[PDB]
């Protein structure tokens, strides 16, 4: 009796951290939700501490690579589009238009194989000045990446809209989430809880700003890794959104030519209307208000007395130097100048921003694949909900010499790290034994 005896228990609530895969669940055809599982039961936890660690999370990786594999799963069974590289006889289109729209929109001309093999065909189109490069009268031209990759077009009936997505773990695993308002990367969260499957995320490709995204709580924050180290980048998140409108001002018809056996092409037709360019309005005062708020925040991390300066982009290629994002089946590239123009010390109108557009993109930083994008008949409107941005810094000198900030970015992986920081999935273990006063029984 005073000798004790061990007994079994089953279902003791303990966990250990591990890693397995997860699965997507949500509720014409888009990339994502062709076939998944349709869908709460949140359970609050208490009297327990836990130490989080983002940037060592794993789920960022497998979601980052299966959306790679999803994206180039999608384009494959549409048309292999090879013979689009013969020389281009080409000129600037429509001179004596002495506006800001001068170098834009060259018109070009070429040869193309017919439906039947031996005959030839001549057909004519418009392109943008960033699309096509001359090699060393007209000049001869080829578009920017006929070499070192192939090209193929997205077959026109599918859509590019981002559906929200839920991520969810299988059984024997658990979703834990910190319910603190303020959170700064890592820390012990005294109020954590569990869920079965994560909330919604709309994974839209973005560079230099986050768009139609999730908000934060009443105090704006920063997140980094190395904070005095300066190698890597800096994420911020606002509390209240500001808005944005832009558009493309043209009506711009299309035409259709077959190439070979049973295939279809679309090229950019000709311009009805006038000639303008894409520009994007923002509210001036609200923008100043929010950026003064975010710098008044981040002065905590660089001393209360120092001078801070905002500068433009550095350079490099176009893919890092400007804010770029799709809208409705095209691609944008604006100038992004007049919002990093200010300096800062201790003591109704809008803002225009010019914006060019490109026709074929090579994203993912993976050279070898390149998509063609069909132009869209009709006018375009595009509104958004503005949230957060990304930032980097330069080198410098001793710590009084007016630190300077620039919008940087480039890498795709951090684009999600802004919105699944609050998640950690873990493996339960239900078996345990313990001594007790069970007078041992036959």
């Amino acid at each position: 009796a005073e000798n004790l005896w061990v007994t079994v228990y089953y279902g003791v609530p303990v966990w250990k951290d591990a890693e397995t895969t997860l699965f997507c669940a949500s509720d014409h055809n888009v990339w994502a939700t062709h076939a998944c599982v349709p869908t709460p039961q949140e359970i609050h936890l208490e009297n327990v501490t836990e130490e989080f660690n983002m940037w060592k999370n794993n789920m960022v990786e497998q979601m980052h690579e299966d959306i790679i594999s999803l994206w180039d799963q999608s384009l494959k069974p549409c048309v292999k589009l090879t013979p689009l590289c013969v020389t281009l006889q080409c000129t600037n289109y429509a001179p004596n238009l002495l506006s800001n729209m001068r170098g834009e929109l060259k018109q070009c001309s070429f040869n193309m194989t017919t439906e039947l093999r031996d005959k030839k065909q001549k057909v004519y189109s418009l392109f943008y000045r960033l699309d096509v490069v001359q090699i060393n009268s007209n000049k001869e031209y080829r578009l920017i990446n006929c070499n070192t990759s192939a090209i193929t077009q997205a077959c026109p009936k599918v859509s590019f809209e981002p559906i929200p997505i839920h991520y969810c773990a299988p059984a024997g695993f658990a979703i834990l989430k910190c319910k603190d308002k303020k959170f700064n990367g890592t820390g012990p969260c005294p109020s954590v809880s569990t869920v079965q499957c994560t909330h919604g995320i709309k994974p839209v490709v973005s560079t230099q700003l986050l768009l139609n995204g999730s908000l934060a709580e009443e105090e704006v924050i920063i997140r980094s890794e190395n904070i005095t180290n300066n190698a890597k980048n800096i994420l911020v998140q606002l509390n209240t959104p500001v808005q944005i409108n832009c558009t493309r001002p043209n009506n711009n018809t299309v035409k259709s030519i077959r190439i070979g056996p049973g295939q279809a092409f679309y090229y950019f037709g000709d311009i009805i209307g006038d000639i303008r360019m894409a520009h994007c309005n923002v509210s001036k005062a609200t923008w100043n208000e929010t950026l003064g708020k975010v710098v008044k925040q981040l002065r905590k991390h660089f001393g209360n007395n120092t001078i801070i300066r905002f500068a433009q982009s550095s350079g490099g290629d176009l893919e890092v130097t400007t804010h770029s994002f799709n809208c409705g089946g095209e691609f944008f590239y604006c100038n992004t100048s007049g919002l990093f123009n200010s300096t800062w010390i201790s003591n109704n109108d809008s803002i225009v921003l010019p914006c060019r557009i490109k026709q074929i993109i090579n994203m993912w930083q993976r050279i070898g694949q390149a998509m063609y994008a069909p132009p869209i008949q009709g006018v375009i409107r595009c509104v958004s909900n503005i949230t957060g941005l990304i930032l980097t810094r330069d080198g410098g000198s001793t710590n009084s010499t007016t630190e300077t900030f620039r919008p940087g970015g480039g890498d795709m992986r951090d684009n999600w790290r802004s919105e699944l920081y609050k998640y950690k999935v873990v493996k339960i273990e239900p078996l345990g034994v313990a001594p007790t006063r069970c007078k041992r029984r036959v």
Partner: protein
Amino acid sequence: VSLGFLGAAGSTMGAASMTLTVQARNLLSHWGIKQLQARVLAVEHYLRDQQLLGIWGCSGKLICCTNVPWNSSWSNRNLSEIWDNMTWLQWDKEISNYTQIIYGLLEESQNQQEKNEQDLLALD
């Protein structure tokens, strides 16, 4: 009350010993591959130790106490603070080593011996 899945995990062992079915019921409850990968994963990660609790002589229930003594050299702690102050999250740590000699000595000393006595005594 029945709080929920992994509910009373922060509380003491006695309150955790009160309600346990909420862990049992939720233990089983181009891109098809990881669906079918997850499901086989989960089902035999369940019943690997369902069968190895089945060899432990109480496959049916969730708490059985069999014919095996306790070695005090594992821990010399009196019964009170075992069940009153330490919780389960701490409890696994100090027997994180002896776990194999638990699972070793457990039923190789029992589920033969008790049914050796069954096969030789009460079927005699």
